[PDB]
Amino acid sequence: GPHSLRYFVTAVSRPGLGEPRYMEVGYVDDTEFVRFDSDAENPRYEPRARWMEQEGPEYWERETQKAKGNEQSFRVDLRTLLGYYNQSKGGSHTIQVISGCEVGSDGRLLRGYQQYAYDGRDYIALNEDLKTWTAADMAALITKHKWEQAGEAERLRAYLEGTCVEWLRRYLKNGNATLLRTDSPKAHVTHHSRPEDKVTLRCWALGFYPADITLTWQLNGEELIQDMELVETRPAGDGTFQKWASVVVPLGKEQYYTCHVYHQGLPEPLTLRWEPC
Template sequence: MAWILFLLFSLDLSAVYCRSHTLHFHITLASAPIPGLSQYSIIMYMDGVQYARYNSDIRRAQFYSASLNPLSEHLDMQTKYAQAFEVWQRHRLNFLMGVFNTTNGEGHIHVYQRKSACELHDDGTIGGYQDIAFDGKEFLVFDKETAVYIPSTQEAVMVSHLWNKHYDSTDSKMFIEIDCIKHMKLYLLYISNDLEKKVPPNVKISSSESESGTKLHCLVYGFYPRDVKVKWIKNETDEIYSEESAEIRPNPDGTYQIRVSVEVTPEEGATYSCHVDHRSLENILVVPFVPVESNKKNILYIIIPVGSALLVLLIVLGVFIYRKVPSGHQSVSTEDGD
């Protein structure tokens, strides 16, 4: 069976491509359930922007862009292929666990990852690659010219021989050079405008008190495309890692938002800032956190000088008015009193 993740229509896909494009498929499969994560997932990226996904929790392929909504029937077919592909990848994970003589005992969970990509260059030529990792270590790379998997490390030499013997790599070559390219051209017909669109993010900083200290919140919203990197930095150099899982969520207007929160124990003289990196920005956006006490002090620093200036102004104005009053008026008032 051909290595096809999604079914493609038999269309004459002719379009003009003004620049190079890359279509990625990232596949992850765990040997046992992991709390908070899908045991099996497929994520599709076009030029680094996430456009579709499938996972073992929802068991349906989903588009992230409304521009692809006309492909609803196509999406149903993609779901069927993604479900079938999940079975094939479980077989490969079990194969690797057998080769490496590993089990799920003592709480160990093993992870199989597969990354495939095809490239369509602006001159019409195509390229691509595929690599496979086990427990976070890449060990097989697909050689598209010879249509075999070659080892990335010395310990993977034996595994590469067994892998090429058990699995027909012709399907991988067909996917990279034919199916993936057709796939890309189909999507480009619908999302070419999306790929050029860039909307810079807005950032709002806030804080709240917690049992262990202070919680800093960085809300980044109204940005496009979807991919963004948000992190908290202490004293301009030290990254603060969040224990909470931050998820990018869609907005009704087609943009996205994300909130990243961290727990900190405020220290005298320490500074905190939220750093945002997005394709729409020429430089990383740095937004400092200003404690409420500092805001109050700043307000006092403003109020006191302004109040003093107003007081001086009133005194000067009073003296000026007093000097302008004619002396005759004062004499009349005295005579009337007699």
């Protein structure tokens, strides 16, 4: 541990193009493992990791029926929120939810998540006490009052402390081996000439998993160059990730700069420099 189980929900109205797009995506430890999409040829919860293929038909039928119920509920709620905000009909709007649990290595709940957004802005969330709500505005206050009157927090807390934690335990047991996998980055430095006898040194990390990584450039043991260019970590398309970091240095000084690559897969951080052919 720690481990987490979270569902990311998206409902997008599209007047004139039929009923709203509706999707639910589940993650175990930030790895997608199940997905439902109303725009699939056959909308149904489907496994998104091979280890989920060990769940029998009852599981998929049950989860699919919940998704279909949630879909109908969010269809209503899109209309409701239009009313709360006195918005005109005919536009496309979005409700999103992040729902789930994080548990410690000892199996105890560390935190619960129930966060809503409307049109990409926070709307309502369950507080850390698992008992009260934070509403973002006067519209969300209406939902908050409905939920207080219905005892929704108590129902949700039962899910977060019970079902969510227990199913996470189940998923981890099936997916343990696969979830633990790491791929170490492979690194190299490239050299590019710039005007005024300057040089771009670019330190690449490729083929790594999971995405968390740190690249740094050092002159003389510092671990310290403030002004690098970095790109955001990006998916290679094969389940691994890429990143690079560059610095501009004077021609004739390239050999004094060192790139370090830090990743959980590595026995020790990588250290490399520009290797003149």
